[PDB]
């Protein structure tokens, strides 16, 4: 039914994830959030997660906003092929201070509705805390996150723990009160997405060498999900997924619910040093 989809979104301090998410003082939606943003899109005409395969995210940009300015997000999915949509994502600035701006390009990526998403994979998640070397509280982890000048407050900050171990980490992940309340409309709660990339993030700290500027999200291979993330998650990310190469870290992200079946994964999930 659909051959062209579009939805347009107006992006500004009033959406909570550009309020409580600052970097290098800018406020800006973690690029995580485009997951959600993409799935919610297909959902509202008729796709179920299931479904789909988001392939081949690129991030042009950063998308900021600062005191009144409103970025308005045009996204259109265009069905190249069938069952294969390319998705741009392309927005102006509006102000007053001065008026609207020129279209700047923030994202394009792949959505292939080919393929259902099945995983087979669980786990024992007692035994994997049983057998963890190390607990890291996840408000540790966000401490030295503001301390390299990368702000969560508040709905963008996921509670939890990182269970430690040689071979890799698990994040146990839930909204916090604020943002718990409004779980409901989401598919992939960018607050349990970007936590997931914090979780991966302290995992890679041994690779980074004392490195303090930031990386912030460039690239996404593969998205695939079986069952929505909406109020809390596990995630697994394993040593032997995580890399770092110059300038470019990669780690593949692992969804499972709380009884421990795999339900999502973000593969070779890319960013880029600031």
Known sequence: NV????????LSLKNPFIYHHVVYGQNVLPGLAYIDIIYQIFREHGF??????????????????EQDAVI????????KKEGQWQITAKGIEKRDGKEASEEKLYMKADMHADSPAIFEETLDLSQIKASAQNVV????????????????????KAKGCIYEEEDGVLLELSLGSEAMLHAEGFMFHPTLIDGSGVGANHLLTSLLKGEQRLYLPLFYESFSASALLQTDCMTRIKRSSVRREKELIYVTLEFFNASGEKVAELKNFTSKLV
Do not use: F, G
């Open 3 to 10: 051959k062209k989809i579009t939805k347009q979104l107006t």
């Open 137 to 156: 509280q996840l408000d540790d982890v966000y401490e030295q996150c503001r301390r390299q000048e990368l702000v969560h407050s508040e709905y963008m």
């Open 72 to 79: 308005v997000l045009n996204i259109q999915c265009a069905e």
């Open 48 to 65: 179920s997660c299931s479904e789909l395969q988001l392939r081949n995210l690129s991030i042009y940009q950063p998308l900021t906003a």
